[PDB]
Design a protein around this nucleic acid. Structure first.
Ligand SMILES: [Zn+2]
Ligand SMILES: [Zn+2]
Ligand SMILES: [Zn+2]
Length: 87
RNA sequence: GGGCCAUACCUCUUGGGCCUGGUUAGUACCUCUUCGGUGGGAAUACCAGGUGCCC
């Protein structure tokens, strides 16, 4: 069990990444920063940063075997599907 | 149409994907270590909640 030792706090968490998540509130700064070249986004949780990393990985089409499009963001893939795989 | 880049989608059900909490577990595994200590950190299984926001 990992405990916050902020003044008069004493809150306890199952895992240290949750403890770091909690202390980020007292500090009012975000712990999980994107390390990609040219990026500066920061997130409240590791899973949220992990999800953000998918933005740099892209969103490749799989609606058809003869497709090859990769979207720079989740929206661009969803918009591509509606236009290129409507039926 | 743009920004955040799925709590956004998928499927039509109290479901999948993604998100959060309690348990298995900060255990197993892995970095550094004068072995006192340090940082990251599962899988597999069980239970509960959530399903876009801004211009
Ligand atoms: Zn605290
Ligand atoms: Zn980034
Ligand atoms: Zn396509």
């Amino acid at each position: 069990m990992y405990v916050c030792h902020f003044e008069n706090c004493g809150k306890a968490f199952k895992k240290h990444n949750q403890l770091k998540v909690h202390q980020f509130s007292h500090t009012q700064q975000l712990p999980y920063e994107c390390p990609h070249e040219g990026c500066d986004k920061r997130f409240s949780l590791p899973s949220r940063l992990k999800r953000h990393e998918k933005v740099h990985a892209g969103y490749p089409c799989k609606k058809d075997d003869s497709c090859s499009f990769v979207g720079k963001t989740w929206t661009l893939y969803l918009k591509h599907v509606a236009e290129c795989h409507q039926d």
